[PDB]
Design a protein around this ligand. Structure first.
Ligand SMILES: OC[C@H]1O[C@H](O)[C@H](O)[C@@H](O)[C@@H]1O
Ligand SMILES: OCCCCC[C@H](O)CO
Length: 404
């Protein structure tokens, strides 16, 4: 019979790749269908380049791909339209924003699988130890707390201790972090949904200068090479007061044998002042059936199983990854395990998107300009003023002649 082959998630980031393979194997066993799991690299932009090799070849060697929220405009030609396979009632069980994101020129490219939003992780033991009663609401508070706790922990002998870790590597995760910095300073969305390239402004420049100010000070010098897992590792060993990261790190930090089990909370990221908007970059992954799959019916059946209530529930409970089904946010077992899903649902609802809708198939080019210019501020090569001017110019070139 058919072998249904899946590329999605990575064994190099948390438990995602291991769990994904488990769920695919479970479907294969339940249905009596042979399956195979193809592993991927950690970083989204590396995965995109890998999967583009299969798509360029029209390869039948992968039936189902797990695709990033930022990808539908890029990957649509390589997707089977899922619209004919779902009833309107079934499609409405997912958040409409994510279904809309995944729909390109009326083609439903992929089913929502898990969503994502950037959040602040904080050591509540350490805040209490240093006399703080709440996590920081502003970036200045974060920096003050980080300076004071670091001074204390270093003096007490922990030479590995930092105030803040985040994703500063030159890759897609930095565009995510940087959108949060920019938007939380009142600097806008880099490219607005209407197409206006708005990033050349003083608030965006301040946000990037502020981030430069952390590097080698409250954050390690090596932060400029950190992706999700590098940040998580410093944090999880107990060596950072704060971390910006996605929901998956919560369950990993609560696992038996984690040094920080029971010692942390999560909240919204800080912002520049009380009237700035809260920033949490929208992330998340979708399930696409390949336009090149020899087994579309079987592949659709697998994608509907993976996106189902019970599989998303297992992802929430075991991996602290955010459902794309509103009903799971009221599920007693989801909430008992992850009470912060209720607390931060409005943050997840108001998450700010990267400019993938407006850039469409040119999004990865836009993003590479963003992360490269941002990275030049983090390293002290450019000031934020120059970087936003240069970024404006690059994005204008990239998007010249691109409409809608
Ligand atoms: O590193 C950036 C990536 O992080 C997470 O995987 C998010 O879910 C994804 O949307 C984002 O592009
Ligand atoms: O693993 C599938 C979950 C079904 C649970 C619904 C439950 O009764 C919510 O309390």
């Amino acid at each position: 019979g058919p072998v249904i082959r899946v590329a999605g998630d990575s064994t190099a980031v948390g438990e995602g790749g291991r769990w994904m393979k488990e769920m695919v194997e479970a479907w294969g066993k339940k249905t009596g269908t042979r399956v195979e799991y193809i592993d991927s690299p950690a970083d989204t932009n590396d995965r995109l380049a890998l999967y583009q090799q299969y798509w360029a070849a029209r390869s039948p060697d992968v039936d189902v791909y797990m695709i990033d929220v930022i990808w539908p405009g890029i990957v649509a030609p390589h997707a089977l339209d899922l619209k004919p396979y779902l009833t309107e009632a079934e499609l409405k069980e997912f958040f409409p924003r994510i279904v809309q994101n995944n729909t390109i020129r009326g083609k439903l490219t992929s089913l929502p699988f898990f969503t994502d939003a950037g959040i602040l992780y904080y050591r509540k033991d350490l805040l209490e130890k240093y006399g703080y009663t709440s996590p920081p609401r502003t970036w200045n508070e974060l920096e003050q707390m980080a300076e004071r706790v670091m001074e204390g922990e270093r003096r007490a002998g922990n030479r590995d201790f930092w105030g803040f870790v985040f994703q500063g590597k030159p890759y897609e995760g930095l565009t995510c972090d940087a959108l949060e910095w920019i938007y939380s300073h009142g600097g806008g969305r880099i490219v607005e949904p209407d197409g206006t390239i708005s990033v050349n402004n003083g608030r965006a420049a301040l946000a990037l200068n502020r981030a430069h100010g952390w590097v080698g000070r409250i954050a390690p010098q090596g932060v400029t090479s950190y992706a999700e897992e590098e940040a998580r590792n410093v944090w999880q060993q107990g060596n950072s007061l704060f971390m910006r990261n996605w929901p998956y790190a919560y369950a990993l930090g609560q696992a038996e044998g984690s040094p920080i089990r029971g010692k942390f909370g999560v909240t919204v990221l800080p912002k520049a002042s009380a009237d700035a908007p809260n920033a949490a970059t929208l992330g998340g992954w979708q399930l696409m059936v390949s336009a090149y799959s020899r087994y579309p019916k079987e592949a659709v059946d697998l994608v509907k199983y993976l996106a189902s209530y019970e599989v998303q529930k297992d992802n929430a409970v075991r991996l602290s990854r955010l459902p794309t089904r509103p009903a799971l946010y009221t599920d007693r077992d989801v909430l008992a395990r992850n009470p912060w899903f209720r607390d931060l649902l409005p943050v997840f609802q108001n998450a700010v998107s990267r400019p993938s809708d407006v850039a469409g198939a040119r999004y990865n080019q836009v993003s590479e300009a963003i992360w490269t210019e941002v990275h030049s501020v983090l390293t002290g090569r450019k000031k934020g003023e120059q970087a936003v001017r240069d970024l404006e110019a690059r994005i204008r070139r990239i998007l010249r002649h691109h409409h809608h």
